[PDB]
Amino acid sequence: IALPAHLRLQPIYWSRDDVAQWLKWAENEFSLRPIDSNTFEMNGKALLLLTKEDFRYRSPHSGDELYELLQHILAQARTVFDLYFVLDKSGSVANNWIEIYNFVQQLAERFVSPEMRLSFIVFSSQATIILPLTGDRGKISKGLEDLKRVSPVGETYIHEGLKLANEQIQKAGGLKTSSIIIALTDGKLDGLVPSYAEKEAKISRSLGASVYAVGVLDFEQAQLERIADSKEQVFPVKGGFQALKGIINSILA
């Protein structure tokens, strides 16, 4: 499971009842020795004032861990959803790269806010994180300039691209954010790559993320249905901006 809705808010707004809820959720998510619901009889503000020693004093068996758990929640700030762009830059898209860039550009510019964090990942014969997971506007702007300078060449090892999104969802994802993976590609895979891509996409859904596939050029509908979570999460680029704008506006509540 994942942080409950009440806990999706910044800790500073947490009620005393929220703090108790947080403790039980943590015990299950981290297999901790159960603690009394009255181990932290205070609100979020007060919890923020406690030292790590206070946590260890109140919970000798799990206080250090709970304290660190709280730090990670704080590190997400106001983020509510993380959006990962896994972009095909193979030779097949060398004459339609601007179509891919404009698609990322419009969605990025639309949803830049303290609630959103973006990552730009490109993949061909090798994968590269162009923009690490961030919600900072200046970083997002430079990331778009880097993205416009991609020279599409190579094979289509989409599993490598999805791996770079999975790793970030493990390290920085979860907690108060829902992760979405937008793979733009034509779905023309070779050899064992289809199995690798489906295996890598299986990791993504195990991390609680939803995989969307945006078909570029004459795209392989069947393949993208095996990468994405379902048939309804596979659409072409034309209208894909309006389609994704609705699903993101929806996940915003």
UniProtKB/Swiss-Prot annotation:
Residues 82-251 form the VWFA domain. The chain holds residues 39 to 215 of 489 of the full protein. A divalent metal cation binds at residues 90, 92, 156. It comes from the Eukaryota. GO terms for molecular function: metal ion binding; transmembrane signaling receptor activity. GO terms for cellular component: cell surface; endoplasmic reticulum membrane; endosome membrane; external side of plasma membrane; extracellular region; plasma membrane. Necessary for cellular interactions with laminin and the extracellular matrix. One of its GO terms (biological process) is single fertilization. The keyword Metal-binding applies. It is linked to Hyaline fibromatosis syndrome: An autosomal recessive syndrome characterized by abnormal growth of hyalinized fibrous tissue usually affecting subcutaneous regions on the scalp, ears, neck, face, hands, and feet. The lesions appear as pearly papules or fleshy nodules. Additional features include gingival hypertrophy, progressive joint contractures resulting in severe limitation of mobility, osteopenia, and osteoporosis. Disease severity is variable. Some individuals manifest symptoms in infancy and have additional visceral or systemic involvement. Keywords: Cell membrane, Disease variant, Disulfide bond, Endoplasmic reticulum, Glycoprotein, Membrane, Metal-binding, Phosphoprotein, Receptor, Secreted, Signal, Transmembrane, Transmembrane helix. Expressed in prostate, thymus, ovary, testis, pancreas, colon, heart, kidney, lung, liver, peripheral blood leukocytes, placenta, skeletal muscle, small intestine and spleen. The modification Phosphothreonine is found at residue 185. Binds laminin, and possibly also collagen type IV. (Microbial infection) Interacts (via VWFA domain) with the protective antigen (PA) of B.anthracis. Belongs to the ATR family. Residues 77-253 are extracellular. This is Anthrax toxin receptor 2.
